[PDB]
Design a protein around this ligand. Sequence first.
Ligand code: SF4
Ligand SMILES: [Zn+2]
Lengths: 191, 58, 149, 72, 555
Amino acid sequence: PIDDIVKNLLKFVVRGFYGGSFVLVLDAILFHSVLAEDDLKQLLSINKTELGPLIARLRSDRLISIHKQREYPPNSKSVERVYYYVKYPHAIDAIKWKVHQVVQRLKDDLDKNSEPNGYMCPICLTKYTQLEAVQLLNFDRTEFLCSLCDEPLVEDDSGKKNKEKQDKLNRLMDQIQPIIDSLKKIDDSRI
Amino acid sequence: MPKKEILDYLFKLFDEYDYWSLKGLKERTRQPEAHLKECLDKVATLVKKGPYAFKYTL
Amino acid sequence: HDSSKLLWATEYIQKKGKPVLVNELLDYLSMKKDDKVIELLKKLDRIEFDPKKGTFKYLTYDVHSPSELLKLLRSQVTFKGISCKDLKDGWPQCDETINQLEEDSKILVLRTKKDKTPRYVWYNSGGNLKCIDEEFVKMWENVQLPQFA
Amino acid sequence: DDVEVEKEVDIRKRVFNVFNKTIDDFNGDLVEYNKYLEEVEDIIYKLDHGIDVAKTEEKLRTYEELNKQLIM
Amino acid sequence: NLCLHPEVSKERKGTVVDEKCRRMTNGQAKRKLEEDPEANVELCEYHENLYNIEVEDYLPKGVFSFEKLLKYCEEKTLCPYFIVRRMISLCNIIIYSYHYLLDPKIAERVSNEVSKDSIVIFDEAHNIDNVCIESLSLDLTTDALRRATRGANALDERISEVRKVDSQKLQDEYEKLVQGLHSADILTDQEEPFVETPVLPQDLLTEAIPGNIRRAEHFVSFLKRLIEYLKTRMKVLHVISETPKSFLQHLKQLTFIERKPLRFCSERLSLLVRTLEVTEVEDFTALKDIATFATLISTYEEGFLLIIEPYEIENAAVPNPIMRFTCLDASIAIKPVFERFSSVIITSGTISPLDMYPRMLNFKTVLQKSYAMTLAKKSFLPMIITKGSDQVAISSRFEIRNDPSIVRNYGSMLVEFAKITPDGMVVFFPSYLYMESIVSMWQTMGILDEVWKHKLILVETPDAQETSLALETYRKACSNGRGAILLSVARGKVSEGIDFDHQYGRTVLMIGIPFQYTESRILKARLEFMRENYRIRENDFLSFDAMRHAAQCLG
Ligand code: SF4
Ligand SMILES: [Zn+2]
């Protein structure tokens, strides 16, 4: 049902923004509900160092939880397993807001390339504010000269990079398109 | 070590021990390793895994 | 020894590139004169030493196809997975097959470049999802997530 | 995505931008439209990749003239 | 099903066999053997002799069945397909399935001489509307776009590489576009056509020019723009419902192709491909299916709905999206059947109720007479097994999985019948996905353990040859002394045409009532149109077809 879509939900984040092996760690969580780290090390034949941070990416993004599988074997030795638990509802929390902010960020570069803010004297290697500007424009002048070069400036943050960001915005929506409603598909049940 | 000589000598060694460790066979040869290894490439069939790991076979 | 001379003669069948005569094969080696080599060549599947005149012609994880390799991934759901070794032993050039059965159809793990893709046997569904820009990879994981509360 | 064919839109769009005065749909006749479509394909496709774009720049010269026809 | 050449008969899929014979003798390929000898093009050797001796008269006096026609044509070096395909104009009675009277890609050989003044009988006509739904349906997948991009790129080389081969042959077909819809050599052919037309039989297609896409190079221009536009329309956020006319409008702004020119893709592709004498078709198979969609999108509207689910719900949240398009009103293909026909008969022993058929398909009946089996002996016991050994209500509506409160009762039902029932037992599960968990979990417990020893069980499988091998070894067991049981699917292929005599079936079990709600909202979108265009609700439509499917299996 819905939780199965949550099972498949994290696959979207894992197989898109990460490498191929990252789902191989996630797949093992769905493979065994109590996923022993020592076993998952053997399953993909990756050493202790190579498998370590892979769980952390699933842990940090609220996708997995390495549950401290402390238990007492027959030998009475310090037995510990990083049981990669699947915290399904909390991983939803991580994917939900991460889609939220990135749409804003790509918008930000658009507005910045539509409102020139500063100036620059590329001859004297000096950038100017408009207030800096209004100090060296002469009443006999139409562009604010400099004080080290006594030369006009250039407008800063013009609109030649404006069109760059819209593709990033459009690529953001078209690539996050599979993810947005996949969260809302789960959020219908809120489980 | 000639290829025929390698073919006969390695088979003479393989008849003694074809299922022998790949390090042990070379020390039993101690010659320019290209000849002994090459004879293992056609006059033997490599088994990397199993109890007879790295052991010549046919 | 019988095997050594027989091996050199049988290896000579494919090396010559010609179906040389039954006897003329022996004189090329000039040392192999036993009948076991002829018996082995007659017993050789690769060396088609048929009833006709002398004819010297060359020839575990039986999953030799992405269809069969996909079945192997299907057999290892919630189960363990061999890396790449017997896979290429029963099927030469698995790595091209891995890319051809891309998007979780040959779902491997490119462990290293010089390792000849030391793969992993795992079974995903869509697998690839490569259209995500690596900038969105940069933009996805720079997010500070609220903790328990 | 065959970036040679990516320029096909720009060549086609320039006809849609500057050379829109060409009589394809406003004339009404199917024979005139069909000849216009073949003429449109003659200009745009050569201007698309440019394997023989020596009259295509001249087609641009006519297209700019068509723009003046729209302009004047 | 009627090929006799050993080279062609090896392949399993019909289209590959159909392609091999067609490429064996094609309007543009078979000419390259007679005029110039080559090993690249072979001969059917049975269409060859049919081309010489068979098309001069009719078959001597036999009324050939499938078994009889196969035997006769084998010895007389003839292929039975090319006989009966030609025999349309000569058969006083014509024998073919529902598709070749309804499916638009194959029903282009229909003859008015055998259609105007004839009498039409629809056998087992209960499953008539469901077939029509598939006729205007098509899916897509992210894998297919990679093939579609392959076809888009590979044909781009194909049309250009032949340009240096014969450029005037390229342009000669361009002047064939201004004159008309290529009627002289797109419809008056024996073998030439390669691209099928999903539209109605040529009546719903204008003959005007397909825009300014005449040029081979300019054909690449709009092809690569439209393929990119559909990919972002293939990676849609979720299932979105837009009228297919609106899809053209959104296409019109992103890729300016007018609706009338886009209707001409089907006759365009055959006009262009024929010029290139193409030799490799594997990556070009995607071209015919996408262009089939292109003809459909520009022609059908306000009766259907476009949907794009980003994944399959059973394997959700994956990059496996679909360009879902399915038929909502089956009557668009149904009505032109009644438009020309004068004598029509619809008869089926499983149609129940009998009243929604005229309202669903919009056709005129006069004699609605029902028949009851009047016999001096019962001979049949329809059962309503609501309660089992536990006396607990049994069904499959609750879930599509297994549960100890339910599965132990159904298995106990199967074993108890296995002890007593005589040879021949056929069951029809609601779905094949349902049964896979049913049998495997049945194997976990010892419930089948006694079922193992009672009778002989052969299972329905996705591959048709194996199931036919399974079924051919079912009937022989039933006729033989040992008892046998067959398990199948209500929506499976067995319920379509299979018969069971005395031995082949004595006690049939029906696990629940089959509801087809398991799939995505495609059917929910389909069901909405039935609710407003017609006065048939979800409840009335669901149970009446489910029992129709139930009554289809029982008889
Ligand atoms: S010639 Fe006839 S029998 Fe032979 S492959 Fe073609 S259709 Fe089949
Ligand atoms: Zn300065």
